[PDB]
Amino acid sequence: GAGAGSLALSLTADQMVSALLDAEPPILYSEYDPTRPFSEASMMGLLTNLADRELVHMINWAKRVPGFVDLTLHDQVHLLESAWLEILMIGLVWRSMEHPGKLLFAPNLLLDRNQGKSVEGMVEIFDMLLATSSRFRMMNLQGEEFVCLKSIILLNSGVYTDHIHRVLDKITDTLIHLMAKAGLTLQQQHQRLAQLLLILSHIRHMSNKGMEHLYSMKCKNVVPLSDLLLEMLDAHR
């Protein structure tokens, strides 16, 4: 039985948060400053260059998420294939919380919604990302809560496309503990858990619209895509 006996299932909530924080990827700068204004091709070029670089670090992070390397390489591939854009997106909205009306793609690449017009159908996605960022800001989402949610996205997003269920239960326990220690009543805890988990359905939704966008940009041949990025896209069709 894969996972049976895992360290992941033995962790305390404090040890699971410690493992998750230790696993965090670096915050990447754009290798290029963009000239003003943007074209469709220079915009998609920056964003696909960035996402490519974030993917490499995402793979390192995934390996250091408790429960993950207890799966077959087959299942690890399928979860990363299913989750990668939702994980890019939860990171983007987390980093963008302290920048109202803007998406901090990188410390040196802050875009507002108008700059999203430079790409056909990008403004709708930015609007949805801004709202998610804005909801997290409303909710005062904490660092520790964020890494828990990013782990759930990883483990959950391809889980129906049992050890995975046991690790998710472990992450649910950890979220509730973080909420209890911050002095939320049981009522406020259950309500907060549900509010954050409901946002994940919206991240899934933005991911699915994102992927249609990314496939439409593959066909237009507007910008080169890395082999890794072409594989990720093929996995969704």
Partner: peptide
Amino acid sequence: AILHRLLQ
């Protein structure tokens, strides 16, 4: 498949 090689 790059992801298999990068994940092993």
